[PDB]
Amino acid sequence: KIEEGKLVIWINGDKGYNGLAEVGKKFEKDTGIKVTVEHPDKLEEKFPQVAATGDGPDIIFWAHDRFGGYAQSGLLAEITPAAAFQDKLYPFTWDAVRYNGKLIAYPIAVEALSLIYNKDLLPNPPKTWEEIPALDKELKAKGKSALMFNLQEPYFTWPLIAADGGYAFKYAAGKYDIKDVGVDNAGAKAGLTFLVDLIKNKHMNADTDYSIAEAAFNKGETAMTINGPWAWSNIDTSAVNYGVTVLPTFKGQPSKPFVGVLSAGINAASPNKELAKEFLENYLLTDEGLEAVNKDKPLGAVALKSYEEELAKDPRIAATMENAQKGEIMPNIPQMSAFWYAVRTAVINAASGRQTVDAALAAAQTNAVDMESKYKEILLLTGLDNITDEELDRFKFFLSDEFNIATGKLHTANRIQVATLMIQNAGAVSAVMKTIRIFQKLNYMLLAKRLQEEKEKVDKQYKSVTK
Numbered sequence: 483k484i485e486e487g488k489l490v491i492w493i494n495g496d497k498g499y500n501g502l503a504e505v506g507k508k509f510e511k512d513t514g515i516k517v518t519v520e521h522p523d524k525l526e527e528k529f530p531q532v533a534a535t536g537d538g539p540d541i542i543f544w545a546h547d548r549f550g551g552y553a554q555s556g557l558l559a560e561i562t563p564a565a566a567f568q569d570k571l572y573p574f575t576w577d578a579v580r581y582n583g584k585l586i587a588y589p590i591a592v593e594a595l596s597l598i599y600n601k602d603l604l605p606n607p608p609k610t611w612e613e614i615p616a617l618d619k620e621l622k623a624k625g626k627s628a629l630m631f632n633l634q635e636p637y638f639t640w641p642l643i644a645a646d647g648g649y650a651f652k653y654a655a656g657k658y659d660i661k662d663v664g665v666d667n668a669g670a671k672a673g674l675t676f677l678v679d680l681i682k683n684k685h686m687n688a689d690t691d692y693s694i695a696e697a698a699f700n701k702g703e704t705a706m707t708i709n710g711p712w713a714w715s716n717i718d719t720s721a722v723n724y725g726v727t728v729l730p731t732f733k734g735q736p737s738k739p740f741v742g743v744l745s746a747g748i749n750a751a752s753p754n755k756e757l758a759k760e761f762l763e764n765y766l767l768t769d770e771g772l773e774a775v776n777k778d779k780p781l782g783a784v785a786l787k788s789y790e791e792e793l794a795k796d797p798r799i800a801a802t803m804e805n806a807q808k809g810e811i812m813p814n815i816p817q818m819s820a821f822w823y824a825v826r827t828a829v830i831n832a833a834s835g836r837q838t839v840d841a842a843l844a845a846a847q848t849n850a851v852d853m854e855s856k857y858k859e860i861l862l863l864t865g866l867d868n869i870t871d872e873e874l875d876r877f878k879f880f881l882s883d884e885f886n887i888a889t890g891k892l893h894t895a896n897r898i899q900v901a902t903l904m905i906q907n908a909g910a911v912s913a914v915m916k917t918i919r920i921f922q923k924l925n926y927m928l929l930a931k932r933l934q935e936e937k938e939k940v941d942k943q944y945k946s947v948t949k
């Protein structure tokens with residue numbers, strides 16, 4: 483369904499898509515091939531929907547965190563740049579777009595949130611979050627506010643939640659442990675409570691979103707905002723003289739923004755892959771190409787070594803990198819989707835007074851991992867990992883109905899692969915129930931009960947945070 487001979491590109495509306503079009507135009511006059519740049523709303527949700535059915539754009543732009551989910555769903559084409567090209571970019575940017583050992587996208591630029599302040603309202607920005615209430619009290623007397631930023635997206639509140647100990651998934655022994663979520667520890671509670679207190683004490687508003695915060699700062703109504711490099715262009719256009727600096731500390735600890743790598747993935751169902759690779763490697767990822775995008779809306783610290791050498795002289799880029807080095811790279815695991823939705827809900831509910839901080843974060847911890855992932859853990863860790871290889875052979879025998887080239891493929895499959903195939907075939911609930919029935923057929927009554935009990939535990943947890 484994807485038209486061959488042209489390039490369709492999806493990029494978020496807050497990025498420099500006009501500049502990217504200019505790169506596309508130059509790419510056209512050099513090979514006669516049309517390049518269309520679109521910025522549909524909720525593209526990071528639309529893409530896994532429309533690309534699963536073989537459609538969608540040829541190239542999708544987003545921060546790297548979404549791409550692992552896409553890759554697990556087989557939506558992305560593996561990219562293979564020559565080592566000569568790989569040397570052109572910083573190694574850590576390639577690290578961000580690597581999933582299960584394979585490169586699943588081209589890294590473009592490194593983004594981190596910074597504290598943006600109005601130099602005319604506030605010559606010396608605060609070093610701590612704790613100073614902010616007093617600063618607000620002072621500025622309110624002048625008819626201004628201290629700080630306004632997007633409270634509707636958890637990306638912006640995360641640096642504060644993570645400052646004193648909050649985290650997404652524990653990284654240990656070279657992998658993210660999805661059984662170890664840190665959105666409900668003492669550090670997370672402390673961070674979110676402080677934000678909620680700012681609202682209760684009338685220093686912020688719960689309903690503040692991106693557009694409200696941007697307008698307020700760019701009109702000189704608020705002394706500070708929190709935003710990324712993509713926002714600098716609009717501030718340049720405004721009458722506000724601004725500085726970009728390190729985020730305030732909380733409890734003596736640096737704010738820890740999630741570091742995003744803007745990345746370009748290629749649709750696995752695209753007939754223009756080779757064209758897409760050519761566009762990215764030879765037109766976009768060049769000094770001239772990146773400059774075109776960057777002049778529309780700043781990219782931050784770009785992945786291209788040669789161009790970044792120039793951009794790094796910018797004090798705003800230095801501030802971006804300082805904040806990034808105090809932060810954490812976003813995990814790209816498929817569970818990141820569930821994580822973000824959960825924390826988004828937690829922050830919104832707590833800020834609005836709908837839930838207490840404790841109840842909101844308790845719910846977020848349970849919801850940070852999707853049911854299918856948890857059910858897969860039951861099937862694999864509690865079920866298959868508790869039986870021998872010979873017992874696994876007896877198990878696979880009962881999987882002959884769900885024909886899956888069981889002649890040789892199923893006989894070769896390891897435990898993870900067996901679990902994946904059952905869930906892919908019947909859905910998570912049916913896969914776990916079938917595993918239980920097979921264990922009961924093999925007379926593993928004890929093991930089957932343990933699976934039932936674990937399933938009951940998971941279901942009860944989800945139930946206790948819904949109403």
Ligand SMILES: OC[C@H]1O[C@H](O[C@H]2[C@H](O)[C@@H](O)[C@@H](O[C@H]3[C@H](O)[C@@H](O)[C@@H](O[C@H]4[C@H](O)[C@@H](O)[C@@H](O)O[C@@H]4CO)O[C@@H]3CO)O[C@@H]2CO)[C@H](O)[C@@H](O)[C@@H]1O
Pocket residue numbers: 494496524525526527545546547548593635636637638710742819822823826
């Ligand atoms: O619940 C309803 C909302 O859901 C949709 O947004 C989701 C996304 O689908 C998730 O992917 C996630 O979003 C993350 C995002 O993945 C992450 O990269 C980061 O996004 C930054 C981005 O890196 C940066 O370049 C810049 O564009 O700002 C972004 C943040 O605004 O952080 C996101 C989370 O805040 O979670 C959200 C929901 O929280 C849908 O798009 C929404 O319209 C919908 O309301």
Ligand SMILES: [K+]
Pocket residue numbers: 547548549550551552814815816817818819
């Ligand atoms: K993901």
Ligand SMILES: [K+]
Pocket residue numbers: 627628629630685686687
């Ligand atoms: K405010």
Ligand SMILES: [K+]
Pocket residue numbers: 717718719720721722723724
């Ligand atoms: K300005």
Ligand SMILES: [K+]
Pocket residue numbers: 609610611612730731732733734735
């Ligand atoms: K502090």
